[PDB]
Design a protein around this ligand. Structure first.
Ligand SMILES: CCCCCCCCCCCCCCC
Ligand SMILES: [Ca+2]
Length: 293
């Protein structure tokens, strides 16, 4: 079970490589038909596509009585998205943000701040419902604010979007499956490896898709996907997980997240999310994962 591990591994990379590229092309075309910006389609359709493994993970974790995991993995992804994902994407393709996109980003900053404030004592099922509503309020607002019978072109767009999404979701669980077989053959029979490599497996569709878009200089789409995913992780993953059990409090991760969200706001308004900014986001990401033990 070693060449099978590599076989699963390399196959996963193939389904993640092309899958994310099709998911981006499908999304870009869909945005053109629904007559919305690359940002809007990234903060809604794309976000929910890549943020689904994060919602299902949190909800299940809190279901089987592991709440500290459900929240720790919920916020840890938001930081991973601004730190690793956005950071890497900005180095590849610097992001100049439009002026109609900043109202959206400001809303994101406030929503994160709102989550941090009510998340000091912890997270009730009350907080969950509140945040769950705000999520939907955000979605219908993002689509509306920035805005057919038998069309062969639209169909092709949906094929790219659906096959592309199936590709990255399958490729991610082939990535993990293969890496686990390799790790086992390597001597790593520890248990945090069975949550570290899987936590990375949930952020893997998000990382790949954002990189695929970054390669095609879709800075707006990249930004939308980061913004949308974090809200889907907080307004959705963090919220749904709180319906089962009372999630604990992490006022050090939330603090860091607000900082990275604040920096994102300032960069996407008075400057840009370019290469040096991305380096900083990466720097803040590595002085975090090391200083948070
Ligand atoms: C760490 C902070 C580095 C310097 C930039 C902070 C954010 C605002 C930049 C405005 C231009
Ligand atoms: Ca509370």
């Amino acid at each position: 079970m070693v060449i099978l591990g590599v076989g699963y591994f390399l196959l996963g990379l193939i389904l993640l490589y092309y899958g994310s590229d099709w998911f981006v092309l499908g999304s870009e075309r869909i945005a053109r038909h629904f007559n919305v910006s690359n940002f809007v389609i990234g903060a809604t359709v794309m976000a929910i596509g890549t943020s689904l493994p994060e919602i299902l993970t949190s909800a299940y974790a809190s279901y089987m009585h592991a709440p500290g995991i459900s929240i720790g993995n919920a916020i840890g992804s938001c930081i991973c998205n601004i730190g690793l994902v956005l950071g890497l994407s900005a180095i590849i393709s610097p992001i100049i943000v439009d002026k109609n996109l900043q109202k959206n980003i400001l809303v994101y900053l406030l929503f994160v701040i709102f989550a941090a404030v009510i998340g000091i004592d912890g997270f009730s099922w009350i907080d969950g419902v509140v945040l769950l509503i705000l999520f939907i309020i955000y979605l219908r607002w993002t689509v509306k604010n920035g805005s057919d019978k038998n069309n062969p072109s639209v169909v092709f767009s949906l094929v790219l979007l659906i096959i592309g999404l199936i590709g990255v979701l399958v490729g991610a669980e082939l990535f993990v499956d293969g890496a686990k077989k390799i790790a086992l053959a390597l001597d790593i029979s520890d248990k945090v490896i069975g949550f570290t490599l899987v936590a990375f497996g949930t952020s893997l569709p998000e990382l790949m898709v954002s990189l695929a878009a970054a390669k095609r200089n879709l800075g707006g789409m990249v930004l939308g996907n980061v913004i949308g995913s974090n809200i889907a992780d907080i307004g959705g993953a963090l919220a749904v997980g709180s319906l089962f059990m009372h999630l604990p409090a992490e006022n050090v991760q939330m603090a860091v997240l607000v900082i990275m969200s604040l920096l994102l706001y300032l960069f996407a308004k008075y400057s840009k999310i370019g290469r040096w900014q991305g380096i900083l986001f990466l720097a803040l990401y590595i002085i975090a994962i090391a200083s948070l033990r």
